[PDB]
Amino acid sequence: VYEDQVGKFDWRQQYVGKVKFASLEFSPGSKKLVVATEKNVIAALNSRTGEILWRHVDKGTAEGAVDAMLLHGQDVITVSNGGRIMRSWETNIGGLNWEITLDSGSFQALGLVGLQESVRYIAVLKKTTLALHHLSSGHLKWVEHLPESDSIHYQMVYSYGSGVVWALGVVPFSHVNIVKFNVEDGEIVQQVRVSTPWLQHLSGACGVVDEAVLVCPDPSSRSLQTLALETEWELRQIPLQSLDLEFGSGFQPRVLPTQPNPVDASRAQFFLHLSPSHYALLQYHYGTLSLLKNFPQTALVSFATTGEKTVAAVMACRNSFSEKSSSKDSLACFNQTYTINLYLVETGRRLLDTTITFSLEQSGTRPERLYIQVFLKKDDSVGYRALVQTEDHLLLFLQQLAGKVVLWSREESLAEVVCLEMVDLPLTGAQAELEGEFGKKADGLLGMFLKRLSSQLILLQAWTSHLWKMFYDARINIDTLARDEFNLQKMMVMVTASGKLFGIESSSGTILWKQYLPNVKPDSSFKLMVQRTTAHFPHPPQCTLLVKDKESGMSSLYVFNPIFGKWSQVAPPVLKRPILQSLLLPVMDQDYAKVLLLIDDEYKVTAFPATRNVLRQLHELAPSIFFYLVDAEQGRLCGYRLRKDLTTELSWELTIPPEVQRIVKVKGKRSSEHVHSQGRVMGDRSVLYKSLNPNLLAVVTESTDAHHERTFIGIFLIDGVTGRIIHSSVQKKAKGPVHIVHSENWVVYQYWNTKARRNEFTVLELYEGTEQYNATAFSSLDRPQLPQVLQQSYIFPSSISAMEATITERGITSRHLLIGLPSGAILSLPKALLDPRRPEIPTEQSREENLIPYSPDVQIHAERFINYNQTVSRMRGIYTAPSGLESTCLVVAYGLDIYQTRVYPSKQFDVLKDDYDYVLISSVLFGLVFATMITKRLAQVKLLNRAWR
Amino acid sequence: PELLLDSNIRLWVVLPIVIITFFVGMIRHYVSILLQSDKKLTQEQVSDSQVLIRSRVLRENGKYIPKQSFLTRKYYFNNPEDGFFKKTKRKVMKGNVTNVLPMILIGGWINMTFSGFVTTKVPFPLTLRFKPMLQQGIELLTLDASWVSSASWYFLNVFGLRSIYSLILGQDNAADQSRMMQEQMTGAAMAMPADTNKAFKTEWEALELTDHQWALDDVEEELMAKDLHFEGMFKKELQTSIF
Numbered sequence A: 001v002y003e004d005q006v007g008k009f010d011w012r013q014q015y016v017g018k019v020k021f022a023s024l025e026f027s028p029g030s031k032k033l034v035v036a037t038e039k040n041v042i043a044a045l046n047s048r049t050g051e052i053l054w055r056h057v058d059k060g061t062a063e064g065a066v067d068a069m070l071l072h073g074q075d076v077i078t079v080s081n082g083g084r085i086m087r088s089w090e091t092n093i094g095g096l097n098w099e100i101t102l103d104s105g106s107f108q109a110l111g112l113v114g115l116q117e118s119v120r121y122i123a124v125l126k127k128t129t130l131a132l133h134h135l136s137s138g139h140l141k142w143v144e145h146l147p148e149s150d151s152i153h154y155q156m157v158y159s160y161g162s163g164v165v166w167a168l169g170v171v172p173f174s175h176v177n178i179v180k181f182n183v184e185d186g187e188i189v190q191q192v193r194v195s196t197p198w199l200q201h202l203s204g205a206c207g208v209v210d211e212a213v214l215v216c217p218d219p220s221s222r223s224l225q226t227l228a229l230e231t232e233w234e235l236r237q238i239p240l241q242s243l244d245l246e247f248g249s250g251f252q253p254r255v256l257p258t259q260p261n262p263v264d265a266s267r268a269q270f271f272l273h274l275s276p277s278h279y280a281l282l283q284y285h286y287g288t289l290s291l292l293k294n295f296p297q298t299a300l301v302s303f304a305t306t307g308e309k310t311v312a313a314v315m316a317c318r319n320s321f322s323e324k325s326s327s328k329d330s331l332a333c334f335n336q337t338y339t340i341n342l343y344l345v346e347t348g349r350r351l352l353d354t355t356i357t358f359s360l361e362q363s364g365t366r367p368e369r370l371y372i373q374v375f376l377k378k379d380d381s382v383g384y385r386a387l388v389q390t391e392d393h394l395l396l397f398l399q400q401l402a403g404k405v406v407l408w409s410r411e412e413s414l415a416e417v418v419c420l421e422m423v424d425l426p427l428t429g430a431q432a433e434l435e436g437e438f439g440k441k442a443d444g445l446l447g448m449f450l451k452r453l454s455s456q457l458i459l460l461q462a463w464t465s466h467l468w469k470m471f472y473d474a475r476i477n478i479d480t481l482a483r484d485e486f487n488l489q490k491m492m493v494m495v496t497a498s499g500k501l502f503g504i505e506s507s508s509g510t511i512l513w514k515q516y517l518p519n520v521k522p523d524s525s526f527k528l529m530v531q532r533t534t535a536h537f538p539h540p541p542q543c544t545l546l547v548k549d550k551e552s553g554m555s556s557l558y559v560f561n562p563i564f565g566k567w568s569q570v571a572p573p574v575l576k577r578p579i580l581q582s583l584l585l586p587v588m589d590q591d592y593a594k595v596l597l598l599i600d601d602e603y604k605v606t607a608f609p610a611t612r613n614v615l616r617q618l619h620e621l622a623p624s625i626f627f628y629l630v631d632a633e634q635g636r637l638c639g640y641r642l643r644k645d646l647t648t649e650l651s652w653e654l655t656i657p658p659e660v661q662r663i664v665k666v667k668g669k670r671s672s673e674h675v676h677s678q679g680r681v682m683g684d685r686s687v688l689y690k691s692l693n694p695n696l697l698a699v700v701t702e703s704t705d706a707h708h709e710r711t712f713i714g715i716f717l718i719d720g721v722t723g724r725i726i727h728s729s730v731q732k733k734a735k736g737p738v739h740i741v742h743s744e745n746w747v748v749y750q751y752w753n754t755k756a757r758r759n760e761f762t763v764l765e766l767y768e769g770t771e772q773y774n775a776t777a778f779s780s781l782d783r784p785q786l787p788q789v790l791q792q793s794y795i796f797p798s799s800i801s802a803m804e805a806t807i808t809e810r811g812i813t814s815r816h817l818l819i820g821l822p823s824g825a826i827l828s829l830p831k832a833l834l835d836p837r838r839p840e841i842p843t844e845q846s847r848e849e850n851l852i853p854y855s856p857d858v859q860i861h862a863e864r865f866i867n868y869n870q871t872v873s874r875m876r877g878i879y880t881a882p883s884g885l886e887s888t889c890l891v892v893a894y895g896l897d898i899y900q901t902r903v904y905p906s907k908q909f910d911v912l913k914d915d916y917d918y919v920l921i922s923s924v925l926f927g928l929v930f931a932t933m934i935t936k937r938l939a940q941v942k943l944l945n946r947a948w949r
Numbered sequence B: 001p002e003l004l005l006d007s008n009i010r011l012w013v014v015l016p017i018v019i020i021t022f023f024v025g026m027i028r029h030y031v032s033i034l035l036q037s038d039k040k041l042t043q044e045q046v047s048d049s050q051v052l053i054r055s056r057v058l059r060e061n062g063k064y065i066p067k068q069s070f071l072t073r074k075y076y077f078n079n080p081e082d083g084f085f086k087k088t089k090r091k092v093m094k095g096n097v098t099n100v101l102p103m104i105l106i107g108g109w110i111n112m113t114f115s116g117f118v119t120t121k122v123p124f125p126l127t128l129r130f131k132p133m134l135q136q137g138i139e140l141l142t143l144d145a146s147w148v149s150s151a152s153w154y155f156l157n158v159f160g161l162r163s164i165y166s167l168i169l170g171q172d173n174a175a176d177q178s179r180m181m182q183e184q185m186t187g188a189a190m191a192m193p194a195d196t197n198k199a200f201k202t203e204w205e206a207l208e209l210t211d212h213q214w215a216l217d218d219v220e221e222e223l224m225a226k227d228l229h230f231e232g233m234f235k236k237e238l239q240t241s242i243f
């Protein structure tokens, strides 16, 4: 069935991290475009279409980061981690050309050195160790130590085609040393010692220009150093009197030097960064400096070369422009419009054909990085492509001249997803009309009869129009966004750690709306909640979003719409310390909206929907709401409760020693979960009642010390209402990542054993006795009983990166467990197999009712593979949403990519079977009528003949 | 009420199954009428059949008979000297109402075609021991037994229209000339078995066991009475004219 339905109602979108080191080489350039990111993924995009050709994922916890990347004519060289392992890739095809193991140093700089004709060695300089490797094969022969390395920082290694390798060493505040080696064999020729008290940093700053000319700017005395390392003896100071000497007070000037690797020589042109935004092209021949094209604004610049000519792209904030403190705005129609122009490097000419203009939609984003790919064509035409990078995470490509400036846009801000949710559509026009027509407050019999007659007349008119439409036939999705019989299309909201809100549709997968937050720093906590649903007409849907910072400690709350995107005009102020925690109140008031209250550091409750009836209901409940807070570094599990109006009081307190145990994860019970059967059958016919607790939290603690044998893994089952541990289970040889999933009454937690290299699977279940309690109103104040706890162990040969359970509205179908694998395939397995009621020896009644003999061996069947072809490189998490029919759950797996499907718990029992031939049924139905009509006359004539004869 | 079902499954299952069972019943009835064949009849068997009918009407209606003629008839039938019954002597798979096999076959084919289906739920609360009866193709243990499959739907459908079939059909009584022939045919079809001797002896002894009670002697009841019906009757005969 899966091979028949390949891509009917499923879709996957592949994404890439933020562009860090991208190259726009490949003079042939069919479609090749290399991108290496800051998430240890290296991809190849296509210039024409934009799809992924080949992509590689290695790491992403703390290691494998890309430091530098070089590009040859056909091959790419890159360094991962921090200077330990290096590997080279290809671009025509994709795979590894060669690999090399480095030494134990601190990666600082790399370069290409060419003996006489072309590059054959790559120079890699570490903090103290220096080496050179080959480019075709992998061999290390050139490696040696420099004279002084302790109080010396080596950066910006420059190489020449003559055959001399130069190394620059600048200390924080003392002296500077330039050292030189040969290429044939490591031999120190001579060392140059230059005194510079105003030279602090050299990592990003000074460059090499002309033929081994060192240039260093300074705003202290506002002057330039130029020195010759090839010849001459000492430095020479250039005061700046021919140029407009304007250096920013608190800004260290930057140089932009260019030197093509294939060409042995270098150029004598470079840009100087002044102030926030002040670029200028200056040329230095021997001692005299020529300045031209004094760029006034010039937000961004880029260099490029294709042959013997060099081009510089200048990107300005033009279009009626009006410049603010730091941002730029155009006051004509669209605002935030930028232009890109080309300029000569030798001279200062400006191309008349080159003029790119483009504007953005969102406000706040400003260009950060930009590349240029200029290629010669025809005889008197220059074409180039610019890749402007958006401020947060977004890629954009522009064409020289065409109908639309924007060719392809790829959203790189949808990789890291923090919180996610799904909401439904408002209504349907005919359905809403029927709902409004039925609405009656107080009327008589005559009024209802008249309303029924009017509805019947409307239905008749609609039927007549429909009949007319079929008789005639016989002869923007945002605007409609309608529902249907089975609500499978839902509007999902994605929140990024960067601070961008995304809205995608479950059916197509096209971006409907995208909004940007003012300012969001890393390590920020997000939480999205839905207060007002879409089923009710009278006020627009309300969606609440809490965000808080970790370093500074501010908390803000936003009220936006998940359907359109525009935020409402209701927003509460936040004061005192950052908001601690919040819960969603099931009770509804005002119109049809629920109540949300939050806790501050002062231990006070703050209500978002300030309403007299809200406060009246809250005061009526009063001792009905409890609060448990869990701390990791403090190791204190203390509880509070509301008293009378608004006040915090301690009720139950728990402390755990941090040195022995450490909190890892805490899971609870989902608010939207209904149980169909409250008991189970047993051997003969006797019933067995379960133990369902709506208020119960499970905490997971791990050992602080890590040893081969000494490992402590345990789980505590506590009630958040009253401090009381139900069951506390402890392991003895468990360590590593621990995953816990909570459900109706069974807990599924996985671990890894150090003694025997394996992953053990423990399933815990709570069961009551044969007799039931009150069973009319549940409360944790009463019920002084201890439920039975059942444990079993299995073997799972995988890592279990992600884990979830399929949750339905009513809960009449099966309960499948979805588990992700490092491969990317997601496997769903039934809870029946992992049942605690698994007798060891096969007994009569157990095998008679419904049971399989217990055996600790679980094999991964290839048939139970939801992911047939589409795989997820990194499985951060999966979200399961209950559909509306009965047995359908929408599963969306997020992470490096996005993928959505529908999972079937137990085949299908709600929709017609696909293989239902209507020809046979219709033929039989017509044949029965034909046969009865045939045999009627036969019976009549038989009766008549018998009567006559 | 739960388990929201499609509107396009009710139009392709319920109406088809209803029409199928209705017209299958009609086909069975009309084919049974067609396959009915007459039985050969010998004049002798008709003769003793009518003799038996005569003895039966003598037994039933014998009160309104002169006593002398009654004993004359009884002697003629008995006649210990010769007797007509005594001398006149002659010489001497498991298909059982096949209607269950066709309905079973039709239900089996209907269930085979529809593997996993939910036709309709029954309001009547049913136990969980009938779940293997009803679903037979659905893998659900938490579901109630109310939701039945197409097999039980058709099984209840065949009995639902059992009394409806007789509403459209009925009995016939015409062909006065052929009525007598029908009576002879059915009566001799009763008298098919070849046990003439024992039947004759049984009738011979039964006829002796009958007594005689002349119902004509009770004439005095009518003489002392009132004749008023004969003028309310006579008043309603006058208005009608002559065509």
Ligand SMILES: *[C@@H]1O[C@H](CO)[C@@H](O[C@@H]2O[C@H](CO)[C@@H](O[C@@H]3O[C@H](CO)[C@@H](O)[C@H](O)[C@@H]3O)[C@H](O)[C@H]2NC(C)=O)[C@H](O)[C@H]1NC(C)=O
Binding pocket: A774, A776, A777
């Ligand atoms: C099982 O739990 C339910 C819910 O807690 C119990 O029903 C409730 O029982 C209380 C105490 O009998 C009832 O309170 C009554 O309030 C009236 C005034 O409203 C007062 O006059 C009475 O003296 C009594 O205090 C409460 O109404 C009742 N609720 C319902 C919905 O019936 C039930 O008794 C428990 N059963 C067992 C066996 O524990």
Ligand SMILES: *[C@@H]1O[C@H](CO)[C@@H](O[C@@H]2O[C@H](CO)[C@@H](O[C@@H]3O[C@H](CO)[C@@H](O)[C@H](O)[C@@H]3O)[C@H](O)[C@H]2NC(C)=O)[C@H](O)[C@H]1NC(C)=O
Binding pocket: A006, A868, A869
């Ligand atoms: C996993 O994905 C690959 C693609 O990357 C699948 O290979 C391609 O599969 C499609 C169908 O899924 C083939 O398309 C077929 O094309 C023929 C005409 O050539 C057409 O008549 C068919 O109706 C169908 O559209 C495509 O040829 C095929 N490509 C290759 C190189 O084999 C692969 O089958 C997928 N794995 C599965 C389905 O297990």
